[PDB]
Amino acid sequence: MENFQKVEKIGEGTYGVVYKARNKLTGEVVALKKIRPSTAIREISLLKELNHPNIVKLLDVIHTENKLYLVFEFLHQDLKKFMDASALTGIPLPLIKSYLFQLLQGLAFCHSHRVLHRDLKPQNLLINTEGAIKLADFGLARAFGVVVTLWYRAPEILLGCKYYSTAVDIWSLGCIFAEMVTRRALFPGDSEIDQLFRIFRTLGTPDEVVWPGVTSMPDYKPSFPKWARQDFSKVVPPLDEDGRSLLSQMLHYDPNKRISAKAALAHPFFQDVTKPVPHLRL
Numbered sequence: 362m363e364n365f366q367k368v369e370k371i372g373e374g375t376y377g378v379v380y381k382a383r384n385k386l387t388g389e390v391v392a393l394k395k396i397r398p399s400t401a402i403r404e405i406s407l408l409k410e411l412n413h414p415n416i417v418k419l420l421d422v423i424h425t426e427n428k429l430y431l432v433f434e435f436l437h438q439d440l441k442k443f444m445d446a447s448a449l450t451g452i453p454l455p456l457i458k459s460y461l462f463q464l465l466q467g468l469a470f471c472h473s474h475r476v477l478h479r480d481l482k483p484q485n486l487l488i489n490t491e492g493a494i495k496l497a498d499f500g501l502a503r504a505f506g507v508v509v510t511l512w513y514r515a516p517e518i519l520l521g522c523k524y525y526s527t528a529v530d531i532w533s534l535g536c537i538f539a540e541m542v543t544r545r546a547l548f549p550g551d552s553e554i555d556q557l558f559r560i561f562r563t564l565g566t567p568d569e570v571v572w573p574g575v576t577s578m579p580d581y582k583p584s585f586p587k588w589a590r591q592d593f594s595k596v597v598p599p600l601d602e603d604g605r606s607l608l609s610q611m612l613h614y615d616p617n618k619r620i621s622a623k624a625a626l627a628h629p630f631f632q633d634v635t636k637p638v639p640h641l642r643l
């Protein structure tokens with residue numbers, strides 16, 4: 362890429378190295394990802410049309426010299442860094458609420474267009490000085506696929522389900538909502554089984570009553586220990602009942618009972634939502 366001046370290396374993405382770069386001709390500042398399949402090309406190309414204010418814009422898909430580069434809209438900070446920076450005092454509830462509401466709008470939009478993220482985490486939620494938050498890397502997982510953080514993975518994925526549904530994104534977002542509130546990851550597993558068991562220890566080992574079909578999942582074992590569900594008021598204190606109610610619906614075990622993004626937007630928790638200005642030190 363002789364058409365971009367590398368300004369800085371902003372990460373080691375899931376697919377490749379990412380650079381903050383400036384377009385020599387336009388002056389535009391972008392995030393350039395070097396990806397390490399014509400099916401992938403056509404699919405990625407479709408994402409260029411998936412435009413929404415809460416979705417990081419995919420500006421270009423460059424396939425030259427038999428290499429693949431994705432050019433994305435640039436934002437100055439991610440939520441993981443913001444949460445660390447706000448760890449001492451915590452992100453104020455009004456801003457947590459604004460961010461959750463905006464992320465749900467982004468999910469509702471993508472899901473309505475049959476596009477899933479599949480790997481939502483604080484690191485791919487980007488923020489700016491105007492109080493906006495945007496989802497990055499939507500659709501890349503399906504376009505490709507095959508240390509990885511497991512903290513936000515839905516249980517159906519951990520249990521080996523081969524077909525993901527929009528519900529996996531709602532689960533991840535619920536885990537992020539909980540982390541913004543408590544200032545600690547909800548389920549910081551360090552292996553697939555530790556991740557699964559951490560979920561079970563908090564929400565109870567699932568059974569056929571709460572999750573019809575769970576015992577027939579590919580990686581389900583009757584030998585799983587049976588833990589009782591913890592009182593929800595102990596999981597994300599001191600979040601209010603509107604917040605706990607919404608979170609509980611985002612963390613239902615059965616993907617089909619899990620609340621949709623569209624339905625979550627209507628939850629009473631958002632009755633007083635506003636759009637505060639975060640304090641960003643760049």
Ligand SMILES: NCc1ccc(CNc2ccc([N+](=O)[O-])cc2C(N)=O)cc1
Nearest residue numbers: 371372374379392434435436437438439
């Ligand atoms: N102080 C460096 C710095 C610059 C920008 C960001 C947030 N922004 C991103 C992070 C990762 C990535 N990434 O593709 O891995 C992209 C962006 C993007 N689109 O702007 C975080 C840190």
